[PDB]
Amino acid sequence: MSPNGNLIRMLVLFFLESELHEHAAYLVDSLWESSQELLKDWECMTELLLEEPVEEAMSDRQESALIELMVCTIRQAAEAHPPVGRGTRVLTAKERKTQIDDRNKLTEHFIITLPMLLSKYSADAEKVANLLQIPQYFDLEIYSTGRMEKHLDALLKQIKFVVEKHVESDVLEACSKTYSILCSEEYTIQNRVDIARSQLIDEFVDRFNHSVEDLLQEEADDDDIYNVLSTLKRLTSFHNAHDLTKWDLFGNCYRLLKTGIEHGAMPEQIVVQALQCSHYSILWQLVKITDGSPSKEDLLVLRKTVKSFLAVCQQCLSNVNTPVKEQAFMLLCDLLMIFSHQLMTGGREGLQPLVFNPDTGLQSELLSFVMDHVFIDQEANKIEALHKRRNLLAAFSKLIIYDIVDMHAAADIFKHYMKYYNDYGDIIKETLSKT
């Protein structure tokens, strides 16, 4: 009760204080065979996280670690296998029976307790993002079974509060995915969740639109900029997993970008988000057109939309801010692959009017960015900025393989930058072997 409480408090301390377990998940996995009963005392954990002390209170850093450890135990119980990296997977009768009973316990428990957790820690972005990994493990049918409607209402209230308070990409994305899970995974509560979502979206589209209008009519305030960016971020996050096409967001994104090319003075983060949002609008237009039975004019309206957006990305390669060039580059390399001739696979030859061959000018600019921003002369931030340039080249590599860009001009650039490997590498290789 408090006995298991002590063991959990010290388990959190051994985790943080020793560098003997770097990954929470790997710690839990390793103790799992021997300490399952303890590691699934979820009532004990939420009690620690929600109660006020008598004495000795938990420190902000230890609270964080307990939430992270709790969520790993919730996964390991639900999935009934070691985490990604410690795998090898056939369950016994009793292992299977235990998994069902565990999923039951943590669903009933966290439906009640997850809104109370999100309420208390609502401003801690890292913590809220971690709590919102929990619903994916819910046995969602139980939101009906337990006459538990009052607690679905409570989670939706708390997700609303979080999204309204936060702009961090991890938080919002966590909110987006939770709605997705809550919505399309059980018909019983699908209708209730859909009404909460679209009211949330509605309130953010109105605020976005009023702020776009404010910015563009204006001299332009710091408030005008905050208001656009803050609302655009929430909508960009959600527009990946949710079809927000019914709200014409591409329209205002398009103006923001046109204004930031013309007068060249649009803040870098607005341009990046405005690009990402426009992209997600187009992908969702594409899906409705693939699955629908679309007319000639449907195709030609989406085409005009796509050619104007490829134009905007091409122009945005010339933006001073390298985060914009990167975003524009990434989108060019997705779109040029998606609206290639691949689009006429699986008997979908109706889509030919949607096919786009990049011109020489554009191909040459997609070559430039690689020389300027992939292949550059000169801690943790650099292993990360390397993986990005890797992804940027890999996204560009696909265009080379299918001759969407000039495959020869490309390999010339790869000659120029590999020269020292081809001129001195054998000599460097054998030298390093003999030390």
Q: How far is the CB of 330 from ligand O2M (least distance, A)?
A: 19
* Contacts of residue 39, Cβ cutoff 8 Å, sequence gap at least 6: 28, 31, 32, 73, 76
Residue nearest to ligand O2M (CB): 409
Indicate the residue among 347 and 361 with the shorter CB distance to ligand O2M. Answer: 361
Indicate the residue among 190 and 364 with the shorter CB distance to ligand O2M. Answer: 364
How many CA atoms, within 13 angstroms, populate the side-chain half-sphere of residue 186? 18
Indicate the residue among 213 and 406 with the shorter CB distance to ligand O2M. Answer: 406
With contact defined as beta carbons under 8 Å apart, do 202 and 242 qualify?
Answer: no
Indicate the residue among 303 and 389 with the shorter CB distance to ligand O2M. Answer: 389
Largest CA distance in the chain: 74
Q: How far is the CB of 315 from ligand O2M (least distance, A)?
A: 17
Nearest to 355 by CA among 303, 289, 286: 303
Q: How far is the CB of 102 from ligand O2M (least distance, A)?
A: 58
| Sign of the four-CA dihedral 218, 219, 223, 229 | positive
Indicate the residue among 226 and 402 with the shorter CB distance to ligand O2M. Answer: 402
Rounded CA separation 339/343 (Å): 6
Rounded CA separation 31/69 (Å): 12
Q: How far is the CB of 372 from ligand O2M (least distance, A)?
A: 9
> Helices 296-316 and 322-338: crossing angle, nearest 10°?
150
For the record, the structure tokens of 373 come out as: 């921003």
Q: How far is the CB of 362 from ligand O2M (least distance, A)?
A: 9
Q: How far is the CB of 360 from ligand O2M (least distance, A)?
A: 5
**Burial degree of 410 (CB within 10 A; 0-12, 13-18, 19+):** buried
Indicate the residue among 186 and 406 with the shorter CB distance to ligand O2M. Answer: 406
Q: How far is the CB of 367 from ligand O2M (least distance, A)?
A: 3
Indicate the residue among 195 and 371 with the shorter CB distance to ligand O2M. Answer: 371
Indicate the residue among 100 and 409 with the shorter CB distance to ligand O2M. Answer: 409
Q: How far is the CB of 358 from ligand O2M (least distance, A)?
A: 9
Indicate the residue among 295 and 364 with the shorter CB distance to ligand O2M. Answer: 364
Binding site for ligand O2M (CB under 6 A): 360, 363-364, 367-368, 371, 406, 409
Q: How far is the CB of 413 from ligand O2M (least distance, A)?
A: 6
Q: How far is the CB of 389 from ligand O2M (least distance, A)?
A: 17
Indicate the residue among 226 and 375 with the shorter CB distance to ligand O2M. Answer: 375
